[PDB]
Amino acid sequence: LVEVADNTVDNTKFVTSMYNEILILGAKLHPTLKLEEITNRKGLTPLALAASSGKIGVLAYILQREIHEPECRHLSRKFTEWAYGPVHSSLYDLSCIDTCEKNSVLEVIAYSSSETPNRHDMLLVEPLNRLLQDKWDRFVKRIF
Amino acid sequence: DRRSIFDAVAQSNCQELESLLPFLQRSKKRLTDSEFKDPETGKTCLLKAMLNLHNGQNDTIALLLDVARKTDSLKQFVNASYTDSYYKGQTALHIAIERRNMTLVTLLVENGADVQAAANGDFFKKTKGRPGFYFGELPLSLAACTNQLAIVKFLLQNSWQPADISARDSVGNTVLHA
Amino acid sequence: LLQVGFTPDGKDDYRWCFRVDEVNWTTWNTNVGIINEDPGNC
């Protein structure tokens, strides 16, 4: 499904929809199995494959995936910690993004070969941008 | 025990309260006792019931109100509020308004709920460093800022207790300032 | 590291989460899924 995406509006919409549907079906049929962790011969996962291939729409969908179905909600990557009035506080997963893995999404995007279509724009997805700004503000600015 | 009643109200199950009411009546204890609210926070069973709603309805609240009135406790029970420095002063009327529940606020006010309680906790003050939501500090200001026209109309024209329209909060802001 | 929920096996779900805040005036949705009863953070 990741390989088929080509960043067009309809293609992206359907690829995301089918990805979500297959994920839900796999969760219902085999709750124990973790589908998104499986890797191909190159060792990439669907998330890493999308990040490296420059599939911006699929990456944006995956990083902000939010499933409200009670039976299958652990699949979500974005959660609402609390809400009082018009104010919401949300959480992002950062499972394989914070450079503490073999090849995180952030490292894969940063160290692209410039052959990837739109690596310039893949850092505008909310969690990546805010994470980079936080890392810059916390400790690295003084080192620079 | 406080834990049992808290679980019963949170689970929306009022079966256990059938013994709690006679238990409290015979035990000679009052819900206002320190042994029925969190030590550091101060939350009461009524507040937990208000927080834990389902589809906007929680029948257990009616049972708690009935038992409280049966023991003559509504005066100090409905007007209970957080004692924590972070939600200081935050009452049940604020929860009722914030959840957009007209019936709950009507029941609370007609049962003696004060309408001039100030939710002057740190979560409610205007602080740029930390998260929060500033709406003034009074129920009328909360209703106006949270977009409940019917609720503000009701508070101003409440028969049991009308809400003062010129009241000012800690920083002096009125409803218009808020 | 924060608790997000429970795995279908029943164990706890703990994840290294990054927190963001947002404001929305049009929605006014009072019926959604939340993790914490008390809104504020410490």
What does this structure look like?
This is part of a larger assembly, with 3 copies of chain A. The first copy, chain A, has 144 residues and is mainly alpha-helical. Helix content of chain A is 42%, strand content 8%. Chain A has helices at residues 9-29, 46-53, 56-63, 105-110, 126-143, and strands at residues 78-83, 87-92. In chain A, strands 1-2 form a two-stranded antiparallel sheet. In chain A, α1 (9-29) crosses α3. Chains in contact: A-B, A-C, B-C. Chain B binds chain C through residues 48, 51-52, 55-56, 86-87, 99-100, 122-123, 130-133, 147, and chain C through 21, 28, 30-31, 37-42.
What's this, in brief?
Chain A: The modification Phosphothreonine is found at residue 80. The first copy, chain A, is mainly alpha-helical and 144 residues long. Helices cover 42% and strands 8% of the residues of chain A.
What's the structural blueprint in terms of helices and strands?
This is part of a larger assembly, with three copies of chain A.
Chain A: H1 9-29, H2 46-53, H3 56-63, E1 78-83, E2 87-92, H4 105-110, H5 126-143
Antiparallel strand pairs in A: 1-2
Helix pairs in contact in A: 1-3
